[PDB]
Each structure stands twice: as structure tokens, then as C-alpha cells.
């Protein structure tokens, strides 16, 4: 029957209380329907973004980070690239769109989508073995080991986009994390008068839905 | 008479004490996180036969570490990451009518046990190490790298007489000779890694020592038979586009 | 004496009691930066009586409330920054740094001469219930810490005295009260029968079950 | 008392007169040493007033 | 299994041999002479436990002098003058399956017993003296102040084999172990003083001696449980004008 109860005479710095209007008897300029209204920060993370898969120790320029190299000369069993899915701590995905949104939260889980698009000559053909390792599993060390697991044989000739929806993507705050590896299966074959190099670009998204809980400040830009 | 239970091995026996009135059941009874129920896991994984001698104190087996080397179940623990299972434990001893003794078969969920020396740490090989019946001892334990193992406090500091809270069945040799405890899955997270966490610990405690008269068998063999029921795991394959 | 019935034994109004859990002092001016503010990891394993009550259950789910009683001795009104760092937040290591200025840490500002400061922390945890007892290891190699998990972790309360350019030579003393609300409990457990030796371990020394009497037939 | 596990055993033997006493108890489950640290004892000691009936099974 | 009889004390047991096919019944089932039925008298007044040793001969208890010191029943005998009662006697012995013996539990109405020395008198303390199982002896008795006590003539001169006329039940240790004899009130006067007259005498006679083999209990405890049923007395208050 009182409002002088303990804990109700303070500034709690997260008040939802209403407060006096500084200047009433002032008309605001009514809102205009501007294109592209945003309702969640999750909409931002559901937009595909070029991830820098290549980011070798000695990197001459910063625009070769988005290019995974593929060449004519290279053995039939050789590894193209390796990734560790952990889009919040792994260096590859750290500064992508998906990475930035995630780092403002302390708990998150869901699925992500990885599209691999071959950007190269229109006359090249070959096959690859995009292989996926479950969270607990070790990355395969040979193409033969990789093939036993979950694998998609991506034909560069008949397709040029391979979309992989990956589940069990969680915060994990070494670590249990999935792995996506890719292996030569046939090598790149070209006819006369065609370059001897091509590249593969990679994209990442936040798939159908993700859930983020509890705000936190970014550990990027320092105060 | 004899209700012969078959699964993939046969166990002939002839009450069921359900853990808390909850039977083991799939999590599906309630894409992003698909599961893979393995329905070939159940079958009677009979453990080793301990000898109940006159001068014995008690025994305990950590679960699910007791079945870590047992067939398919053992394999799945290595392969898969997250998994949940319930268990049907049949503890049967075989004794005559000239043998007198009492046992408390109790399933204790989440029992943290203190070290023998206060303020010291001990290795994981001091609690569990495959299928072994670790032995409680009379008096104190002064071996630094061992668990406290004092029977009267049950190695937890709770008093041994009060262990009757937990789902328990008494094997009084005078009358009955079998105890069936159907333990469901009890944890605060839907499913957990089966190496890190020891879900529950089965303890068999002799409350009355065995007296066998004269020129009769000097031990009563106690056999433990565990069947993992309704075991679920995590999917290992990708979702659709 | 007569019989009747009860309703004072329900779990909610058994464990739900306001009880002191921490008391500390701090001086605004001295040569030790440790003593210029108060740190306090939230846990309910410091007050022995309170501990024993809660440990008769294995899983507990509750949202607490924390009330502070602050007094000060030596002129004008004095204000206190009562910050709450939640799990995985930045913690101040010294008085005045960017961790105090963090806007994701709920911070009360209470000035003396008013009714005590209070706030109600909700049920934080990604689990479905805090677990008093944990029978496992931090890693699956099983060489880590024993009987410790991070899902029962609660944040820290950091209290500092809001001061100008040059502080006063005042000293203050804080007392913290802690009370569960809307408690639910699952799986009961036998009471303790040994004296606690550590604030985080379950370590004990063996003790006799009960007191002795002269003879079994003798009862007076 | 030599060990602490013989506290739960009331002894009965072949040799003992036909009129002899086996055991004695005083029902007061909150102050009597026997029932002091049992489940029933522990719950009761957190209260200052209590009454009802208890059940004693002898097996 | 176990038909637990309750009255005000409990006796767990598991045929009834009625005295002559007549159950105990009130005299009212048939002012100047009012009666006062006491309905609180019945309850199991368990007597002392005799030991059936290998070298024993037999035992007898005079009724109603055996219950003269037993509770309410005992009190009423002192207070009141005239009283009549019927009795339900449960004679149970407890023995294993390695013990062999035979007993004749017989209720003999009005047994006058001759003195040890012919033409001599003996005191009332030689037949009854509260609750005591007086012992028959082998051969003659030459103690002047004792009863004849020769087992073969049953202390009455009638021959021990012919005692089967009276309501009797045989406790053969081979099979059964309990004898229930429901004795009604038999006298030639409606009700009589309970100190002067000993209504009937219960005799337990071992016809086959106990042989217990080796390293087994050397006695078989025979317990007698008597419940007085339908006991009536005389009024102690004046009539109306």
C-alpha cells in the first residue's frame, strides 16, 4: 500500500518509465515512407557475403583473399581448402556480415548456408568432393577418408553453384566444430587457348532462422 | 514362474521400481538440430560377477562409463557427440536358504564424491575405469589420490541410512533375490556428451553381513545386467536447401 | 496442542528467505586499488546455513532479488554506482576504466538518505535449471577441473563510490541480502552430515552417524 | 561401538533367556538420539511446532 | 496365509475343535438375580513359554486358576462372587523340519487327582499356584504332599491312551503346528465361585519324545494363549421398588 518501498527511488539506467516532454505544443514532421525499412538486425545477417577463405601467412595484396586458387597442374588427390565452421571466432568468418551481427550477442545457434561458386573460364570441366565432418569428428586427412563421410560430388561442367545448408552451428564459448573440406577428384581440364588458372568464391548466410540472446558489446572497435 | 525376456540376448528371471514414475522415452515425444534414434542398442549387456564375501563392504559402478567398452553402445559414444539414454538394471544374486544377508540396491543421480585428503584433486581413474566394481572400505582412506570411500558416509558425506530417498530396492536373501530398477534420463540439458558427465552411480551396499554357517559356498555371486533403452543421438548429415 | 494442517513446508516459502550473504568495506582513498571498490561473484555457498537448505535439491530454478544496505562515515550527499556485470561481460580491474562505462551492465545509482537499492536479476543460464551438483569434468579428456560447470555461473556485482575529480577520505560498508523468488525444485537429496571444508568442493572428513547411549535396553 | 555399520543391526541370538529384552525406544523423533539424524528427524528440526503420527516397520 | 485375530492384542496364526459342538454363550440366551456381562474381559492372555526338552514327560494347567493373576479377569474373580466363562485356547509350538515329536493337547473337564500316598491329603498349592505348568513325572511319586503324577495313568488312574474321549487335538510336528480348542462352560450349576472350583484342566502330553538330530536347537517352545469369551458375572446393585 506504499510507493516508498525499498528499491523505488533510484536511477536504474534501463528504466522503461515515461518522462515529461521537454517542449510540448510542438508538431513533429510526420514520417515518410522511405524504401527499405529495417525491423531486425537478423535481416542484415540473412544477406549473402563474400567470405575471405584464402588468407595465407604471406599475402601480397588484400584482394586475393577472396580467391581460392585452382590450377591445371596439381595431383589428383590434393586438398583445395579447409574451413572450420564457427562463424564467431574463426578468422575467416570473423569480419563477414554474419560475423559482425553475431559478435553483438553472447548466445546464438541455428544453421548457416555456404554457396560455392566457380568463377572461371566457360570451357573448364572437372569434379570436386566437398566433404562435411560432423561436430565431434576429426577433419579427413586423405580424399579416401573424406569420401566415406558426407560428400557431394560437385560437377564444375554441369553446375557452377553448390549450396550447402549446414546444421549444428552454436556459440561454443579445443572446441567441437564441424569442418568443410574440398578435394580434387579429376583436376581442371581445359581445351587450347584457355587460361591455366581459375578461382572459387565462397558465400555465407544465416539461413532460414537464427536466434540471438543477450546483448554484449563488440570486441572490435576499441573505445 | 519365468518370464523370459528376449531382445537379442535372453535373460530368464521372475517388482519394477520406476525411477520417479517416468519411463524412458524419446525426446521427440514432447533441420536445425536433427536427431538419430538408434534402436539396435538395447540388449542385455551383462557385467562381471562380483563375489559377495563375508568380509566385504560395498561396491559402485559409474554410468554410463561402465558400458563404455560394451559393443555398439561403446562405439556410439566415440562416434557421436550428444546422446541420451535410459537404463533397465537387473541386479540378481543367487543364494541358498542357509545364507543370510541384506543388500541395498540404489541408483544415485549425480553423486559428486570428495577426495580422501581434503583440498586435493584426484584423477578420473579413481572413480571409473571401464567396467569395474570399485570397493568402499571400512574406516578412512589415507591414500591421497583415492576417493574418500568411507562406507558410513557413503563417500558423499550424507549418512548411509538416508540413501533411501533415491529409487532403491532391498534384496533381503530371506525372501526375494531380484531387483529391477528402471532409471529414466535425468539431466538439466536435453542431451549431453557421454564422456564428460557421469549421469548416475549404481551402489550395492550390504547392510547385513553374509553368514554362511559351515561347509557351504563362501560367496554369493551378484550379477548386474544393464539394458540401455530408448537411446537417441545427433544426426550426422546435412539438411535440405 | 491440536493437529490441523500445514502450508509452511512448500518449497517456495522454504527456500525463499532474505538472508545476508556478503559484507565488505572499501575506502575511497588509499594506496591499494583492490580496496577502492568491492567485487563479489554471486554464489550461494558462502553462508553455511543457506547452503545446507538449498543442497537438499539437485536442480533449482529461480530468479533472485538483491537488496543492498550501504552506510558511510567520514558532508554533502554521496552517490553509489552499484553495477551488475552479467556472465561473459567485461569486469573492471581498477577504479575508473571503460568497464564502468559499459552500457550493457545494469547499473543502479543510489544516493544516501533514501530507501535501499534493489533490483531483480532474472533466470540467466542457457540450461533449463541450475545444478547444485555436477559429477563430471570440464573436458572429455577428463584432466580438467572436477565438479564444475559453467551453466550454474552467475555474474558479479561491483560497487564503487561515484566521486568527483578528487574523492573524499570517506569509507563505506556494504551488506548484501539475497532472496530466491518463484523457486521450483526437482530431485530431492539427503541432508548434509559433515562440516563443510571448502566453498566449492564437497570434501569432508568421516564423522559418526549418531550420538551414543549406554545400552540398547536403556532409555530414559 | 567398534564400527558405524553395526548401528543399524539389533542383535538376536540363539542363546538368551526366554524373558529378556531385545531393545527399547522412546518415541520423540526430534530430540531422541535414535531418530535425530534420520530423514524424519532432519525435516522436523527446521520447525518449532509439529504433531501427527509416525509409522515403524520392523523387518 | 495368516488370519490376524485382533481383540485388544493381536495374534497372527493360521482347525477349530469345538468342545462338544457348543459355542460359549450368555446365560441370557435361554430383579431377583440380575447379571452383569463384562465384555472387556476378552483378549489374548498369553501364558509363559515352556521348553519342550528331549527328556520331558508332560505338563498341566488348572483353569481358571491360571488366569487368576491376569489383568481384569484376575480382578473380577476377587470382586465378584459368581461368574461363568468359556475359553478359546491356542496352543502353538515352533519347530523346524529336522525335529520330530508328537503332542496330545487335551482339555479334561473336572479332573480329580489322587494323592501320591494313598489315604493322605495335600494342599491346594500342589495342583495350582498361579500360572505354572506343573510337571508330570516318570515312575511313581513318593513325596507325600504331592499329587500322584505318573504319566501312564495321567494322575487320575484312567490310562493315558484313553484320554481321546475329551476334546483333543494332536500336534504332530511333521505336518501341523497349531491346536485351537474352544471349550464351552460345562458345570451342573448355572454359575459358580471361581476360587473354589477348578473347572477344567488343560494337559499337553508328548506321546513321541523330541529328537533333534545334531547341532540344532535343543528345545521347542510351546506357548499357550487363552482368551476368555462370553464372561458373565452377578449384579452389584439393588433392584427397583
UniProtKB/Swiss-Prot annotation, chains B, E:
It comes from the Viruses. It is found in: Virion; Host cytoplasm. Interacts with capsid protein VP1 and capsid protein VP3 in the mature capsid. Forms an icosahedral capsid of pseudo T=3 symmetry with capsid proteins VP2 and VP3. The capsid is 300 Angstroms in diameter, composed of 60 copies of each capsid protein and enclosing the viral positive strand RNA genome. This is Capsid protein VP2.
Amino acid at each position: 500500500p506504499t510507493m516508498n518501498t525499498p528499491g523505488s527511488t533510484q536511477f536504474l539506467t534501463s528504466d522503461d518509465f515515461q518522462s515529461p516532454c521537454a517542449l510540448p505544443q510542438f508538431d513533429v514532421t510526420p514520417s515518410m515512407n522511405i524504401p527499405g525499412e529495417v525491423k531486425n538486425l537478423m535481416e542484415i545477417a540473412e544477406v549473402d557475403s563474400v567470405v575471405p577463405v584464402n588468407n595465407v601467412q604471406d599475402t601480397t595484396d588484400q584482394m586475393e583473399m577472396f580467391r581460392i586458387p585452382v590450377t591445371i597442374n596439381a595431383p589428383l588427390q590434393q586438398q583445395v581448402f579447409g574451413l572450420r565452421l564457427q562463424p564467431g571466432l574463426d578468422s575467416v568468418f570473423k569480419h563477414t556480415l554474419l560475423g559482425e551481427i553475431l559478435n553483438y550477442y553472447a548466445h546464438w545457434s541455428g544453421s548457416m548456408k555456404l554457396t560455392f561458386v566457380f568463377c572461371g573460364s566457360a570451357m573448364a570441366t572437372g569434379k570436386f568432393l566437398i566433404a562435411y565432418s560432423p561436430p565431434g569428428a576429426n577433419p579427413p586427412k586423405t580424399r579416401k577418408d573424406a569420401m566415406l563421410g558426407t560428400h557431394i560430388i560437385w560437377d564444375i561442367g554441369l553446375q557452377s553453384s553448390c549450396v550447402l545448408c549446414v546444421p549444428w552451428i552454436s556459440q561454443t564459448h579445443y572446441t567441437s566444430a564441424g569442418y568443410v573440406t574440398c578435394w580434387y577428384q579429376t583436376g581442371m581440364i581445359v581445351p587450347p587457348g584457355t587460361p591455366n588458372s581459375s578461382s572459387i568464391m565462397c558465400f555465407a548466410s544465416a539461413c532460414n532462422d537464427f536466434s540471438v540472446r543477450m546483448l554484449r558489446d563488440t570486441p572490435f572497435i576499441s573505445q | 514362474r519365468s518370464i523370459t525376456l528376449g531382445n537379442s540376448t535372453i535373460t530368464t528371471q521372475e517388482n519394477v521400481v520406476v525411477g520417479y514414475g517416468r519411463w524412458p522415452t524419446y525426446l521427440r515425444d514432447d533441420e536445425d538440430q536433427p536427431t538419430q534414434p538408434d534402436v539396435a542398442t538395447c540388449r542385455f549387456y551383462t557385467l562381471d560377477s562380483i563375489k559377495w564375501e563375508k568380509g566385504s563392504v560395498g561396491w559402485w559402478w559409474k554410468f554410463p562409463e561402465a558400458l563404455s567398452d560394451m559393443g555398439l553402445f561403446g562405439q556410439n559414444m566415440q562416434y557421436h557427440y550428444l546422446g541420451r539414454a535410459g537404463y533397465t538394471i537387473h541386479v540378481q544374486c543367487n543364494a541358498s536358504k542357509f545364507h543370510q544377508g541384506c543388500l541395498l540396491v540404489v541408483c544415485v543421480p549425480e553423486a559428486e564424491m570428495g577426495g580422501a585428503v581434503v583440498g586435493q584433486a584426484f584423477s578420473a581413474t579413481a572413480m571409473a575405469n571401464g567396467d569395474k566394481a570399485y570397493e568402499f572400505t571400512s574406516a578412512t582412506q589415507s591414500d591421497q589420490t583415492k576417493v574418500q570411500t568411507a562406507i558410513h558416509n557413503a563417500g558423499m558425506g550424507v549418512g548411509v541410512g538416508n540413501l533411501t530417498i533415491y529409487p532403491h530396492q532391498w534384496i533381503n536373501l530371506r525372501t526375494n533375490n531380484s531387483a529391477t530398477i528402471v532409471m529414466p534420463y535425468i539431466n538439466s540439458v536435453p542431451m549431453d556428451n557421454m564422456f564428460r558427465h557421469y549421469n548416475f552411480t549404481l551402489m550395492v551396499i550390504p547392510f547385513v553381513k553374509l553368514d554362511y554357517a559351515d561347509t557351504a559356498s563362501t560367496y554369493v555371486p551378484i550379477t548386474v545386467t544393464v539394458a540401455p533403452m530408448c537411446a537417441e543421438y545427433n544426426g550426422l548429415r546435412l539438411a535440405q536447401a | 496442542k491440536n493437529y490441523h494442517s500445514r502450508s509452511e513446508s512448500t518449497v517456495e516459502n522454504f527456500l525463499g528467505r532474505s538472508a545476508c550473504v556478503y559484507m565488505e568495506e572499501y575506502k575511497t582513498t588509499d594506496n591499494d586499488v583492490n580496496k577502492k571498490f568491492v567485487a563479489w561473484p554471486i554464489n550461494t555457498k558462502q553462508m553455511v546455513q543457506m547452503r545446507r537448505k538449498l543442497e537438499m535439491f539437485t536442480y533449482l530454478r529461480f530468479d533472485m532479488e538483491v537488496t543492498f544496505v550501504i552506510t558511510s562515515r567520514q558532508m554533502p550527499v554521496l552517490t553509489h554506482q552499484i553495477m551488475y556485470v552479467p556472465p561473459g561481460g567485461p569486469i573492471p580491474a581498477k577504479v575508473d576504466d571503460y568497464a564502468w562505462q559499459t552500457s550493457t551492465n545494469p547499473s543502479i545509482f543510489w544516493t544516501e538518505g533514501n530507501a535501499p537499492a534493489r533490483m531483480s536479476i532474472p533466470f540467466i543460464s542457457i540450461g533449463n535449471a541450475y545444478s547444485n551438483f555436477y559429477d563430471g569434468w570440464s573436458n572429455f579428456d577428463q584432466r580438467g577441473s572436477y565438479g564444475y560447470n559453467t551453466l550454474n555461473n552467475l555474474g558479479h556485482i561491483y560497487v564503487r563510490h561515484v566521486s568527483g575529480s578528487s574523492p573524499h577520505p570517506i569509507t563505506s560498508t556494504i551488506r548484501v541480502y539475497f532472496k530466491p523468488k518463484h523457486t521450483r525444485a526437482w530431485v530431492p537429496r539427503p541432508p548434509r552430515l559433515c562440516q563443510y571444508k571448502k566453498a566449492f568442493s564437497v570434501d569432508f572428513t568421516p564423522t559418526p552417524i549418531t550420538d551414543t547411549r549406554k545400552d540398547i535396553n536403556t532409555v530414559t
